[PDB]
Amino acid sequence: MDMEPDVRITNLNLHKGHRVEVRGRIAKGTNRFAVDLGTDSRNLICHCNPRFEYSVDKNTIVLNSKQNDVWDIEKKETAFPFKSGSETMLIFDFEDCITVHLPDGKEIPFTCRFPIEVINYLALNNIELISISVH
Amino acid sequence: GSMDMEPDVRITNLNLHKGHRVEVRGRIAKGTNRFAVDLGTDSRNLICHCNPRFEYSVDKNTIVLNSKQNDVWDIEKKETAFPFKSGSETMLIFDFEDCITVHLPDGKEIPFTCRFPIEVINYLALNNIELISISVH
Amino acid sequence: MDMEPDVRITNLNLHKGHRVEVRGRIAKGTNRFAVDLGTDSRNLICHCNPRFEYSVDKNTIVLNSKQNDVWDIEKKETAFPFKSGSETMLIFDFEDCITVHLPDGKEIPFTCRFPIEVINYLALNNIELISISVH
Amino acid sequence: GSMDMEPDVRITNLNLHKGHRVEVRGRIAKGTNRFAVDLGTDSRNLICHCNPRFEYSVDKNTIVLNSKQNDVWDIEKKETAFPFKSGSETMLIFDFEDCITVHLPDGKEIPFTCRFPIEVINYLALNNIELISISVH
Ligand SMILES: OC[C@H]1O[C@@H](O[C@H]2[C@H](O)[C@@H](O)[C@@H](O)O[C@@H]2CO)[C@H](O)[C@@H](O)[C@H]1O
Numbered sequence: 001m002d003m004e005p006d007v008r009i010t011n012l013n014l015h016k017g018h019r020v021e022v023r024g025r026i027a028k029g030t031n032r033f034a035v036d037l038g039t040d041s042r043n044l045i046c047h048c049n050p051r052f053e054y055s056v057d058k059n060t061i062v063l064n065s066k067q068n069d070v071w072d073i074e075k076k077e078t079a080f081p082f083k084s085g086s087e088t089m090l091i092f093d094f095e096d097c098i099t100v101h102l103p104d105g106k107e108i109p110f111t112c113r114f115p116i117e118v119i120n121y122l123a124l125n126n127i128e129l130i131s132i133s134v135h
Numbered sequence: 136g137s138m139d140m141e142p143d144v145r146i147t148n149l150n151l152h153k154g155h156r157v158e159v160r161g162r163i164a165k166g167t168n169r170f171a172v173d174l175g176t177d178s179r180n181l182i183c184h185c186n187p188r189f190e191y192s193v194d195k196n197t198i199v200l201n202s203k204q205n206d207v208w209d210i211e212k213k214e215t216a217f218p219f220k221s222g223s224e225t226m227l228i229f230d231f232e233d234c235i236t237v238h239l240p241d242g243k244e245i246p247f248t249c250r251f252p253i254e255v256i257n258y259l260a261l262n263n264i265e266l267i268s269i270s271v272h
Numbered sequence: 273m274d275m276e277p278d279v280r281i282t283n284l285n286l287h288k289g290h291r292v293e294v295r296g297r298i299a300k301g302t303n304r305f306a307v308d309l310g311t312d313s314r315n316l317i318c319h320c321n322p323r324f325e326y327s328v329d330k331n332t333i334v335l336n337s338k339q340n341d342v343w344d345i346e347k348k349e350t351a352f353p354f355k356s357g358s359e360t361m362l363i364f365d366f367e368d369c370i371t372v373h374l375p376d377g378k379e380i381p382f383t384c385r386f387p388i389e390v391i392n393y394l395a396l397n398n399i400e401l402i403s404i405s406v407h
Numbered sequence: 408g409s410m411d412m413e414p415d416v417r418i419t420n421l422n423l424h425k426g427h428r429v430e431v432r433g434r435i436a437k438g439t440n441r442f443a444v445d446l447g448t449d450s451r452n453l454i455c456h457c458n459p460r461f462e463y464s465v466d467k468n469t470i471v472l473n474s475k476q477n478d479v480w481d482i483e484k485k486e487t488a489f490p491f492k493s494g495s496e497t498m499l500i501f502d503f504e505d506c507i508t509v510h511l512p513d514g515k516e517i518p519f520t521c522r523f524p525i526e527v528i529n530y531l532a533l534n535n536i537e538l539i540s541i542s543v544h
Pocket residue numbers: 001002047049055056062063064071074
């Protein structure tokens with residue numbers, strides 16, 4: 001991948017009915033960043049990928065899932081409450097349907113593409129960790 | 136009536152000095168017309184009234200900033216960036232310097248120069264937003 | 273009172289089934305500090321008052337309630353996980369019986385001395401605010 | 408078996424430099440004999456293994472600190488202050504400098520000098536404690 005790998009967490013043990021809050025500083029001048037959740041690096045239930053400019057996307061959020069290292073079909077959100085070099089916060093509610101809380105107060109649904117009962121893997125790409133909290 | 140906001144928390148003796156920041160998280164009242172976070176020395180003397188308006192007065196999805204001295208409002212500054220949804224959580228961070236910086240949750244900042252001399256912000260209030268947390272650094 | 277008044281919060285609207293977490297820096301070299309919860313300054317459901325040295329108490333927590341400015345009967349805890357000039361954290365679970373979570377993992381019960389359904393008043397004395405959060 | 412702790416979170420690519428601190432909140436496993444928070448470059452090379460022991464080996468209600476290089480443990484440092492209860496939440500803060508400072512939740516600090524040269528802590532692990540939050544400053 002092109003992005004700079006930042007923090008990874010393994011053995012996260014995040015079960016359904018719980019949420020993860022990710023705060024961090026978006027890389028200055030970056031084209032895109034991502035927060036990934038899943039079972040391991042090859043198996044992502046949620047790849048949340050705001051793009052300043054990448055591929056055909058400009059100030060768009062791409063969401064996707066990855067199974068055995070193959071990407072599923074992208075879903076795209078046009079709301080874009082981000083600025084590179086700035087702090088941001090994303091909250092992920094883990095249920096049968098994931099809810100991504102954007103920092104502008106919008107909630108984006110993303111249904112689980114594959115059955116999963118525990119998220120053990122979390123990764124940050126092109127965003128420097130400030131804090132991660134689970135509730 | 137609805138031209139008035141419901142008072143939420145008031146914090147006194149905040150002792151926020153220049154070179155420091157305050158972070159406010161809270162849940163915006165559902166269906167509300169506007170909400171505010173106010174900073175100053177007391178309710179009559181505000182160095183920064185940060186008032187996002189969903190619909191109020193002539194303003195639609197617009198941030199109004201102002202100051203208040205001796206209970207009289209000064210000139211409004213308006214910002215068109217509007218990263219808020221009523222009924223949702225939000226976070227505003229205020230960097231206290233000679234020029235206040237209002238960090239919006241979409242990563243934009245709004246400068247707001249101190250309109251009167253002030254060295255300590257001791258008063259912070261929330262209106263039409265329910266406290267989740269307040270942090271100082 | 274002798275202690276330095278630090279932050280006060282009014283209109284806190286803390287209902288039963290919820291908790292407040294108070295982080296702060298204990299005044300350097302201080303004799304005691306307190307976190308107070310109640311309906312207003314004259315009416316405290318919980319005055320949590322760790323004493324380094326005050327009155328007959330040395331490295332003891334005094335808990336009390338105050339009604340119309342008159343103190344009730346003190347309850348005292350000997351566990352003393354505090355150091356003056358240092359950061360600390362106290363968590364208060366609001367129920368019919370308040371639970372004070374000390375930073376050493378101990379939970380101290382304090383029953384409500386008077387009927388109260390909302391805590392609207394919070395005060396810090398001889399401790400400088402770092403953060404207050406409600407859940 | 409019970410001489411081994413259950414692995415909890417592992418964080419890699421932490422990029423913690425000197426002059427900065429990491430704060431770890433978590434819930435200590437109920438009934439457990441010991442728990443640990445480890446800092447270093449990987450699991451074989453630890454600049455600080457902070458291991459409060461309820462009862463383990465010759466140690467009762469004692470903090471064991473050590474370092475590990477090339478998967479070999481160095482000399483244990485023991486601290487008698489023990490502000491922990493199994494099954495409860497706890498918070499440990501680590502200030503990374505030439506001398507690490509371990510801030511215990513009772514307000515005591517434990518110095519732990521760097522036993523080998525290190526400029527970045529990239530690995531952080533929790534054993535017999537369930538993550539609540541990790542924060543860097
Ligand atoms: O679906 C998420 C991944 O997208 C990959 O990029 C896609 C791109 O989004 C699409 O427009 C088309 O161009 O093909 C690209 C490569 O398959 C990223 O490279 C990857 O990192 C994910 O974000």
